[PDB]
Write a protein that binds this ligand. Structure first.
Ligand SMILES: [K+]
Ligand SMILES: [K+]
Ligand SMILES: [K+]
Lengths: 660, 660
């Protein structure tokens, strides 16, 4: 969601000198100056900014009087025109310019900035100058002033009386740029050229899933047709092949119109580069795959598409497991096809006209019930039994079960089963490794929690901490890991540098900013500083925040629960739900003694800000410091003692007073 | 690629007093003084340096006048000679020296330094001295002055009239050291003695690979010939054994000429140590291996070479997997040989003349179709079937499949298969462990990324951060891990102490040094300091760098993208591609309030330098501070406010002015 507006202007201007200036401000100050205007005028792009976009500060002695007023109305009412003005450069050189004013538009059709395109026509006109000594001085400067607009732009007729042709060319340039000078200043979305498909669109993902399904179907079906002959053709299996072939041809055609992700950058939408990118990467595999035994078996090259498209899924853990189960099934099927091919070859030695007792097909025929007949040779098991038997055998050898119904007993079968076992061992090992890694991924976090728990327990047991204090520590550990689930705030906030840290911290401390009268005249910067400086704590019933002699160095705001400030074993304050206690740091400059114990009745919630951070923030911002001083009344100041005398003391002392 | 020049000089001088001095500088200052010249003259090697290499500061009263001039021309035109001079030591002792000047040469044949070898001939001449009281004082000092040159060098004829012999010896010494005094001062490469082969050469790696292939071939072939008899000799299997044996003899001969890597140091090229290093390490295994059943079976000791040479490959993960697959195959082959040996022994009990029904050879003969005949005993399976069957069986027991075609049923076979299973369990477990470690190696990094992603997601969900801000955080996380791929700059730059940190940081910030006019009069040290002090940030569209009240404490250089400085909801500046904004830290000494909001239009790229580091660098370097102050013009100073009044305000106020 970029806002590429300067990029479009510099891509369309083709070495121009646009002078973008603000519109809603009086005098229309200049906002941006291209580094082509720094040469046409001699002003560096630090002295031209914040000046009028009329170029009023280059208007001089003999500047055309009417043009100044006319461009003034042109800026008054928002409209676009073109002018020929006679300005002065930084060297007081009378030089002509072509003004191509064109207002810009906002998102919801509002004028925001004024664009001013400039061109130099010094050699194209007659710049009458007073401080001259010879006629030639009136000509050489013409070659000096125009260098990139005469030898580059108009060099075909550099002859006199063609100045009217130059004026006509300027008029044609200004008239035929109605939409080229208004790229609609706006925060837009990425745009693609016509007839280009985004690689992450909703259609492309569905197309990729369909291609994956079809590739798996072809991988399943091609070896079956190659090995289990099945040369009989039907209606429900001869049109599907053609449909899949034309679908893959459509995919090849449509893959020329995809947005290839750049090496570390973003998407590229240039048809002039994607075409040979695809050509050099994967135009060989697809062509051969989508074109006799070789022609029907080459279709297995379609797995390259599956390999390419499965990159983001391969990152996860369970996706690799599903992929490996799928390839396990596919490898079992392929080995079943090869096993049946061997078994069919070996039966019935063709040199003689006998049947080999060794081959697993003969043993399977014996164990099934249907034997071979005739001596041409006909009989044996049906076509479903052969495939299910081959798959069963090659699945008993990949899972390392090996029952022994169907087993190698011929010279070829044994030396093929050796390769079967060699491959299956590695495949099965990879499956085991993936499963154990998947389990370790979660048991890592669980064991990370349990290790800390065990370390705390062993530390408490080793130093014989008395019961009643170890219980509190263990309860705190359990409760904090229950509430937070091991999610530390500091590690998460370390990431996301200080643009989102401030926003997150302002959101977290919303319960001390929105509902408290001190933080209502604070600018956003001060609120961000305070939010990033607070930090928060969680209390538990019976826990003391301040003792009877601790140094108060924090302002604490209670957002949930109830506190109890007790002094001399007497309750002197009860706090809760919007009460602030602590000390007046900003006008005492001395750490105090906490005069009373602040216990927690219920499960409390406090946002405490340290003394130093608060003092720094209040020192940096002045007006908010006064507002905070005036608008903060502490409900329990833990610096001054409350002077009182209990009733029981009076009642006791009265007895002795009467006695004496 | 060392520059060992002092080492060669001290190894060749044999306790001399060379006085290396620079040549291209006037007066030829002394550069280095050996700690043998600190005794011949009494000058410590801190007062003799930066003095003339002519020893002009030891030239005294009665020094030989002609020799001073002659050595002066000898230094004038670059040439080597020898002189006999009469200098004074630190104690003003008239002492004779032998000068052996010899210029040194650069890489491309240039004179750089002048070498001056010295010797003492005090006792070898007549040092007439004035402050003497008795004749014996003219003799004892002769023994005092010469101690390491008379009792060590010339002690065979310590008799008078032999001083001419000493002069002849000095002449022979100086004449026959033409190349020994010029070791060609140059940054050379490691040099090996003639007829010594570098262990990491391109020939040695090919030789090692060939030896590995031959060792695997021998390991495959020797047990087959020992067990599967095959005593018939052919032409294609009797010369190969001799060729391999002579190749291994050549390897044994050639292993005496290898550069053994020292214990923690570098290669050693001393033939006097490598020979007994190899002799003590591995001269016993090779000799016996390269020398009846014992003689043909001892050739399996060649696996020691494989074990030795496979040390760097064993570090990786996949190499161990390939090695374990190879040893799995080799162990299966060896167990096949042992299994066939047992099966061949057990058939046909030789005490009687019957055939044992139990032995697996008989069952295999029944299941194949070819039975035993005769009762000497002839028939059975062919020689290919026996080996393929043995390998199949011992592969069904190592992969834990166990079909059951071929299975132990005799007393010996069962108690051998027990050991088979015991070994195979451990081998198969090791293969599984290696596979799971290999997978964990990469899933560690992937899970490390996913754990942080999940923690961020759970933190956002737990604290109910509103939508529209959690989306930005998640997008930032995804985008930064996409661009950087988890490669943190700080951890990489922590390594490589501050010689390559400076160079790397200068290279990274090349887009603010080369194309910016402030950094053009800065020495390399200042550029290194600034580069190591910058740090860089990446922005995103809509992200704010400075708010309306933040403290500007950084100079920011934009190298890619576009920024937008807006004040009072009005665009006042547009930045991009070489624009610097911030504050003038070096002449204000006060943190300011950012007067405007700096938003990012497109994906920006900023190099920001903090206030304190910049101030330290500009304080340490003085002239560059002035150059930086003069040559830096901020395009948007975020300290001063721009005073303006919008057009809508004027238009609105005019209506009320007319109304009243
Ligand atoms: K099994
Ligand atoms: K069985
Ligand atoms: K079995």
């Amino acid at each position: 969601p970029q806002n590429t507006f300067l990029e479009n202007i510099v891509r369309r201007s083709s070495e121009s000198s646009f002078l973008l200036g603000n519109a809603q401000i009086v005098d229309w100050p200049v906002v941006y100056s291209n580094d082509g205007f720094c040469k046409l005028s001699g002003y560096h792009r630090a002295d031209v900014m914040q000046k009028s976009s009329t170029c009023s500060f280059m208007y001089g002695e003999l500047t055309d009087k009417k043009t100044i007023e006319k461009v003034r109305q042109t800026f008054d009412n928002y409209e676009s025109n073109c002018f020929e003005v006679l300005l002065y450069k930084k060297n007081r050189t009378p030089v002509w310019f072509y003004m191509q004013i064109a207002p810009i538009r906002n998102e919801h059709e509002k004028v925001v900035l004024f664009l001013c395109t400039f061109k130099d026509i010094t050699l194209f006109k007659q710049p009458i100058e007073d401080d001259s000594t010879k006629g030639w001085t009136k000509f050489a400067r013409l070659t000096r002033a125009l260098t990139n607009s005469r030898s580059v732009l108009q060099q075909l007729t550099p002859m006199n009386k063609t100045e009217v042709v130059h004026k006509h060319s300027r008029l044609a340039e200004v008239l035929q740029l109605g939409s080229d000078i208004l790229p609609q200043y706006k925060q837009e979305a990425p745009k693609t050229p016509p007839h280009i498909i985004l690689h992450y669109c909703a259609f492309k993902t569905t197309w990729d899933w369909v291609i994956l399904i079809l590739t798996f179907y072809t991988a399943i079906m091609v070896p079956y047709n190659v090995s289990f002959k099945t040369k009989q053709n039907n209606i429900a299996w001869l049109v599907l092949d053609s449909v899949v072939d034309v679908i893959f041809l459509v995919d090849i055609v449509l893959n020329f119109h995809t947005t290839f992700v750049g090496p570390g950058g973003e998407v590229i939408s240039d048809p002039k580069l994607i075409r040979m990118n695809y050509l050099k990467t994967w135009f060989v595999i697809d062509l051969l795959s989508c074109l006799f035994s070789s022609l029907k078996v080459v279709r297995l090259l379609r797995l390259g598409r599956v390999a390419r498209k499965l990159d983001h899924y391969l990152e996860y853990g369970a996706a690799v497991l599903v992929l490996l189960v799928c390839v396990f099934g596919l490898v079992a099927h392929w080995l079943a096809c090869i096993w049946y091919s061997i078994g069919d070859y070996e039966v019935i030695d063709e040199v003689t006209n006998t049947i080999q007792i060794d081959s697993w097909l003969y043993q399977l025929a014996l164990s099934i019930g249907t034997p071979y007949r005739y001596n041409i040779w006909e009989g044996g098991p049906s076509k479903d039994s052969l495939y299910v038997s081959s798959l069963y055998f090659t699945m008993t050898s990949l899972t390392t079960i090996g029952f022994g119904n169907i087993a190698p007993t011929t010279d070829v079968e044994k030396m093929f089963s050796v390769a079967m076992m060699m491959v299956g061992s590695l495949l099965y090992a990879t499956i085991f490794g993936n499963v154990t890694t998947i389990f370790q991924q979660m048991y890592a976090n669980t064991n990370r929690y349990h290790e800390m728990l065990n370390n705390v327990r062993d530390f408490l047991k080793l130093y014989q901490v008395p019961k009643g204090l170890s219980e509190r520590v263990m309860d705190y550990i359990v409760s904090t890991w229950s509430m937070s689930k091991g999610i530390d705030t500091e590690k998460v906030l370390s990431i996301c540098p200080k643009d989102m840290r401030a926003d997150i911290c302002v959101h977290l401390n919303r319960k001390v900013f929105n509902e408290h009268p001190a933080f209502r005249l604070a600018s956003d910067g001060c609120l961000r500083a305070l939010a990033v400086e607070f930090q928060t704590i969680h209390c538990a019933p019976g826990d003391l925040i301040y003792h009877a002699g601790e140094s108060v160095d924090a302002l604490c705001f209670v957002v949930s629960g109830s506190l109890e400030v007790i002094q001399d074993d007497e309750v002197v304050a009860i706090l809760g739900k919007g009460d602030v206690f602590g000390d007046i740091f900003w006008k005492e400059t001395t750490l105090a003694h906490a005069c009373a114990n602040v216990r927690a009745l219920t499960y409390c919630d406090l946002h405490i800000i340290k003394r130093e951070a608060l003092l720094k923030v209040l020192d940096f911002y002045t007006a908010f410091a006064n507002s905070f001083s005036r608008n903060l009344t502490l409900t329990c100041n833990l610096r001054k003692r409350i002077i009182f005398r209990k009733i029981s003391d009076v009642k006791k002392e009265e007895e002795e007073r009467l006695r004496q």
